[PDB]
Symmetry: C3
Subunit: 90 residues, 3 copies
Amino acid sequence: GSVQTAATSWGTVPSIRVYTANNGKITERCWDGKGWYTGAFNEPGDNVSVTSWLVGSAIHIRVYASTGTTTTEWCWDGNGWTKGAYTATN
Amino acid sequence: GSVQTAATSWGTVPSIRVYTANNGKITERCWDGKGWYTGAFNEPGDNVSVTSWLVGSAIHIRVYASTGTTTTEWCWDGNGWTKGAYTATN
Amino acid sequence: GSVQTAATSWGTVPSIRVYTANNGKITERCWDGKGWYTGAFNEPGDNVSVTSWLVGSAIHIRVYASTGTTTTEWCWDGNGWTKGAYTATN
């Protein structure tokens, strides 16, 4: 078929993050104004969406990774990706 | 295969909305700072994207739901989801 | 199957752009406050994501178009779509 991407950006430089789901794995490419590099994000999933917001100059990111009917939320809040509270039902 | 999601967020809390297309139906999970709950959005579609913007503190949301080659726009503007003017051609 | 869309918006009017991948081709519909029209964007791809940001009142847009395992970045910066520096690896 084809890979699936999600993108987000922030600030005025801007920083950009592109998430790619490929063969069950989601990886991350980053731009902070100079060039593209690989980011810390590495999680399983066949589909991905993303949103982010600033608190002052600190970025917060939520990546929604889906495999089958299970969507897991992954959070960046300044110190590592942690799994989020998101659930699909209830 | 797998479900497909789209996500958007606003404000500083933030509020978050995650839309999930699953088996022809798009449903909505919401976060306003405390926990996740099911939102009012319920429309047919196999694919979804979303964008939103603030006017002061009031949120406006546009959800693009696609089935086959027909994309329908759905609008939140403070008082219920209504169908939008979006058309694909002409 | 079904077409795939990505959406972005900016400003307070707002302007909206909806990108649709359909049968290998990504096209663009635009809203600047009056009605929907077809935009300049026309590129190959089976999947698309998008992000955008303002610098003052000038919009900058990045559209990520994927075919197979090749994601090409397309840039709008006020004067035509140009191909971006994005690469997936290295």
